[PDB]
UniProtKB/Swiss-Prot annotation, chain A:
This is V-type proton ATPase subunit E 1. Disulfide bonds: none annotated. The modification N-acetylalanine is found at A1. Subunit of the V1 complex of vacuolar(H+)-ATPase (V-ATPase), a multisubunit enzyme composed of a peripheral complex (V1) that hydrolyzes ATP and a membrane integral complex (V0) that translocates protons. V-ATPase is responsible for acidifying and maintaining the pH of intracellular compartments and in some cell types, is targeted to the plasma membrane, where it is responsible for acidifying the extracellular environment. It comes from the Eukaryota. Belongs to the V-ATPase E subunit family. V-ATPase is a heteromultimeric enzyme made up of two complexes: the ATP-hydrolytic V1 complex and the proton translocation V0 complex. The V1 complex consists of three catalytic AB heterodimers that form a heterohexamer, three peripheral stalks each consisting of EG heterodimers, one central rotor including subunits D and F, and the regulatory subunits C and H. The proton translocation complex V0 consists of the proton transport subunit a, a ring of proteolipid subunits c9c'', rotary subunit d, subunits e and f, and the accessory subunits ATP6AP1/Ac45 and ATP6AP2/PRR. Coiled coil: none annotated. It is found in: Apical cell membrane; Cytoplasmic vesicle, Secretory vesicle, Synaptic vesicle membrane; Cytoplasmic vesicle, Clathrin-coated vesicle membrane. The modification Phosphotyrosine is found at Y55. Expressed in brain (at protein level).
Swiss-Prot record, chain B:
V-ATPase is a heteromultimeric enzyme made up of two complexes: the ATP-hydrolytic V1 complex and the proton translocation V0 complex. The V1 complex consists of three catalytic AB heterodimers that form a heterohexamer, three peripheral stalks each consisting of EG heterodimers, one central rotor including subunits D and F, and the regulatory subunits C and H. The proton translocation complex V0 consists of the proton transport subunit a, a ring of proteolipid subunits c9c'', rotary subunit d, subunits e and f, and the accessory subunits ATP6AP1/Ac45 and ATP6AP2/PRR. The keyword Acetylation applies. Belongs to the V-ATPase C subunit family. GO terms for molecular function: proton-transporting ATPase activity, rotational mechanism. It comes from Rattus norvegicus (Rat). One of its GO terms (cellular component) is ATPase complex. The chain holds residues 165 to 376 of 382 of the full protein. Subunit of the V1 complex of vacuolar(H+)-ATPase (V-ATPase), a multisubunit enzyme composed of a peripheral complex (V1) that hydrolyzes ATP and a membrane integral complex (V0) that translocates protons. V-ATPase is responsible for acidifying and maintaining the pH of intracellular compartments and in some cell types, is targeted to the plasma membrane, where it is responsible for acidifying the extracellular environment. Subunit C is necessary for the assembly of the catalytic sector of the enzyme and is likely to have a specific function in its catalytic activity. It is a peripheral membrane protein. This is V-type proton ATPase subunit C 1. Keywords: Acetylation, Cytoplasmic vesicle, Hydrogen ion transport, Ion transport, Membrane, Synapse, Transport.
Length: 56, 197, 57
């Protein structure tokens, strides 16, 4: 019941879905990378700052 | 079972979004399935439908679709009176089924071989013992009724059709004088057993 | 046209895989940088306290 144009529309629709999920995933991962960057920086810097203060 | 029907080339494999489902469409509605499947659910792959197998009532067709539309796909397919099979490609289960059947059939043949020899020997011995038992029943009754020394005249007959009455009348007149009343259902004036073959 | 459909979808899957792998690579790099910067601050703190100690000593 669907023509070549419509089947192509459906294929594009599915690809659009795939691309949207790909973009959301990449953005979410980058945001998490930023969060973990700051988290690890805090953990590390406080851990060793504490050690420094103790040696002091 | 689809073990002998479904091939790896029937399913869309290694897809992130797509799954291939097999749905049985009655042959009368085969074209309707082919025409309708493309529009049964949102986000399905058009023109992907093909036929894996057919029988006298229906065709089994595979469709590739977005995973999350499968619920709508199978729901609406059912609404249009198409039946979806609960099947996904699985090489190990089909191979296991094929070998298990091949093994059990061979095992049947292998036991058959020894089966007939086993049972035929057991029969031979069972029949030999059977008649041996009857012979002993003859010995015991003959001695028990006539005393010793144990010299009796035992004989086998192969009765002729419709002569049972005559044989009984003859045997009775021939031997009735020995018992007169000790021996219908089993009692005759002589040792008597039947062999049922 | 069943193969063209899946061709398009698997290429989209490929792109998605590349996108998320790259995002994970970025995460790994950012986390290493984060550790390096934290350690740099730790060294700054160390130098400051070491300087006060030696001054007082």
């Amino acid at each position: 019941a669907l023509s070549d144009a419509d089947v192509q529309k459906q294929i594009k629709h599915m690809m659009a879905f795939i691309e949207q999920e790909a973009n959301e995933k990449a953005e979410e991962i980058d945001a998490k990378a930023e969060e973990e960057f700051n988290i690890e920086k805090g953990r590390l810097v406080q851990t060793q700052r504490l050690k420094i203060m103790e040696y002091y | 079972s689809l073990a002998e029907i479904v091939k790896k080339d029937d399913f869309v494999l290694d897809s992130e979004y797509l799954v291939t489902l097999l749905v049985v469409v009655p042959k009368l509605n085969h074209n309707d399935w082919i025409k309708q499947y493309e529009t049964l659910a949102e986000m399905v792959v058009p023109r992907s439908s093909n036929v894996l197998s057919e029988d006298q009532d229906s065709y089994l067709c595979n469709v590739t679709l977005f995973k999350k539309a499968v619920d709508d796909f199978r729901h609406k397919a059912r609404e249009n009176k198409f039946i979806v099979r609960d099947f996904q490609y699985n090489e190990e289960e089909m191979r296991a089924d094929k070998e298990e059947m091949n093994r059990l059939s061979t095992d049947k043949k292998k036991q058959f071989g020894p089966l007939v020899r086993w049972l035929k020997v057991n029969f031979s011995e069972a029949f030999i013992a059977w008649i041996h038992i009857k012979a002993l029943r003859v010995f015991v009754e003959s001695v028990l009724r006539y005393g010793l020394p144990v010299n009796f005249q035992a004989m086998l007959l192969q009765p002729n059709k419709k002569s049972v009455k005559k044989l009984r009348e003859v045997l009775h007149e021939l031997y009735k004088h020995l018992d007169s009343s000790a021996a219908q259902q089993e009692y005759y004036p002589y040792v008597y057993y039947k062999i049922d073959c | 046209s069943q193969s063209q459909g899946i061709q398009q979808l698997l290429q989209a899957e490929k792109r998605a895989a590349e996108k998320v792998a790259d995002a994970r690579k970025r995460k790994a790099r950012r986390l290493k940088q984060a550790k390096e910067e934290a350690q740099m601050e730790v060294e700054q703190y160390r130098r400051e306290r070491e300087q006060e100690f030696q001054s007082k000593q």
